Design an enzyme around this catalytic site. Sequence first.
Site, PDB file in Angstrom:
ATOM      1  N   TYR A 187      14.119  -7.985 -12.808  1.00  0.00           N
ATOM      2  CA  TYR A 187      14.250  -7.507 -14.177  1.00  0.00           C
ATOM      3  C   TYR A 187      13.115  -7.984 -15.075  1.00  0.00           C
ATOM      4  O   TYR A 187      13.114  -7.669 -16.271  1.00  0.00           O
ATOM      5  CB  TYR A 187      15.601  -7.940 -14.752  1.00  0.00           C
ATOM      6  CG  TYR A 187      16.776  -7.552 -13.880  1.00  0.00           C
ATOM      7  CD1 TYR A 187      16.816  -6.317 -13.245  1.00  0.00           C
ATOM      8  CD2 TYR A 187      17.836  -8.427 -13.679  1.00  0.00           C
ATOM      9  CE1 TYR A 187      17.883  -5.960 -12.442  1.00  0.00           C
ATOM     10  CE2 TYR A 187      18.908  -8.077 -12.877  1.00  0.00           C
ATOM     11  CZ  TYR A 187      18.926  -6.843 -12.261  1.00  0.00           C
ATOM     12  OH  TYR A 187      19.989  -6.489 -11.462  1.00  0.00           O
ATOM     13  N   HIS A 232      19.715 -11.024  -3.678  1.00  0.00           N
ATOM     14  CA  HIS A 232      20.182 -10.000  -4.611  1.00  0.00           C
ATOM     15  C   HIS A 232      21.012  -8.925  -3.922  1.00  0.00           C
ATOM     16  O   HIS A 232      22.061  -8.528  -4.432  1.00  0.00           O
ATOM     17  CB  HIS A 232      18.995  -9.368  -5.339  1.00  0.00           C
ATOM     18  CG  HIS A 232      19.300  -8.940  -6.737  1.00  0.00           C
ATOM     19  ND1 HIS A 232      20.346  -8.098  -7.044  1.00  0.00           N
ATOM     20  CD2 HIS A 232      18.709  -9.252  -7.912  1.00  0.00           C
ATOM     21  CE1 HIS A 232      20.382  -7.903  -8.349  1.00  0.00           C
ATOM     22  NE2 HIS A 232      19.399  -8.592  -8.899  1.00  0.00           N
ATOM     23  N   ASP A 243      22.053 -16.595 -15.793  1.00  0.00           N
ATOM     24  CA  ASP A 243      21.880 -15.916 -14.513  1.00  0.00           C
ATOM     25  C   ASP A 243      20.857 -14.802 -14.687  1.00  0.00           C
ATOM     26  O   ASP A 243      21.146 -13.784 -15.324  1.00  0.00           O
ATOM     27  CB  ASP A 243      23.218 -15.360 -14.018  1.00  0.00           C
ATOM     28  CG  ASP A 243      23.189 -14.971 -12.555  1.00  0.00           C
ATOM     29  OD1 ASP A 243      23.278 -15.873 -11.698  1.00  0.00           O
ATOM     30  OD2 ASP A 243      23.086 -13.762 -12.262  1.00  0.00           O
ATOM     31  N   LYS A 288      17.632 -14.673  -8.593  1.00  0.00           N
ATOM     32  CA  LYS A 288      17.942 -13.943  -7.374  1.00  0.00           C
ATOM     33  C   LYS A 288      16.661 -13.498  -6.682  1.00  0.00           C
ATOM     34  O   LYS A 288      15.643 -13.237  -7.328  1.00  0.00           O
ATOM     35  CB  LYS A 288      18.832 -12.725  -7.669  1.00  0.00           C
ATOM     36  CG  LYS A 288      20.033 -13.039  -8.550  1.00  0.00           C
ATOM     37  CD  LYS A 288      20.914 -11.818  -8.749  1.00  0.00           C
ATOM     38  CE  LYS A 288      21.971 -12.072  -9.810  1.00  0.00           C
ATOM     39  NZ  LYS A 288      21.352 -12.337 -11.137  1.00  0.00           N
TER      40      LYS A 288
END
Length: 310
Positions: free
Chosen positions: A52, A115, A47, A82
Amino acid sequence: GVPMITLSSGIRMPALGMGTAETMVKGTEREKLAFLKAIEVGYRHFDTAAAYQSEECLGEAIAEALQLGLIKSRDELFITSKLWCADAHADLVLPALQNSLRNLKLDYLDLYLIHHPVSLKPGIPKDHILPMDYKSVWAAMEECQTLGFTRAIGVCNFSCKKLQELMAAAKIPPVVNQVEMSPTLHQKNLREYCKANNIMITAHSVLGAICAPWGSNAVMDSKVLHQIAVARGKSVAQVSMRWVYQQGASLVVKSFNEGRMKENLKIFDWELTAENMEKISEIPQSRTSSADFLLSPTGPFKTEEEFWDE
């Protein structure tokens, strides 16, 4: 091994997945080696998120896992990414997903999530947080699945109130709602609605995010969980993660070392007794992962009670 969870669309999901460290900075090659180590240990559900910049590390790890024969095909994995709020606009969702797929060196995702229930002005700054259009963004998410770039679509950190708001014009209902859930946040009301609508609950921050600035110590320093852990011969971490699964929930965990990620797979070989759950049900409540980085006096949500509807 890790049991499979049948989602509402018929798609099988590994009940236990491994996420990425929530650092909005570039990706280290030690992250890539951690993903490759998880595949070698027995993880198949991974995931990530575009916020990020760690997708390329998972893409490199998947490629080398296929080179090393650890997995024989990509369809052995369950990859989830996401949609970042800056791309949470109608015409910007498909370019966002295709970018994550190019970074991941993949052709399709197994699950694509939203998200946060907010939008951002395409460019934390509090002037940029914009109210989300749930109907137009989800329709774009629905098209992402029809075109074949993802097998399923879902949401993250959506309150029960906001889910019904997204469920109004939904042609393809959300398969998964990834929310914070732990022995300090039971989410009874949200799990009650999602169970009646066949929405899967995936738990993040099962350990209260002890390593993040927005986290707390309410789970890892709980003397209730310590007492159960000793009675059952387990760690505090395994008691909390077993509790999430025993409540009928999926969970994504962040594993920075091979010691913990090997122990995390053992939550499916034992069972919490009836009292153990009753002693946990009375644990006082405290929400760790706060969206105060998304609270703006100019945006849609200005308090913690509006973002979570609690």
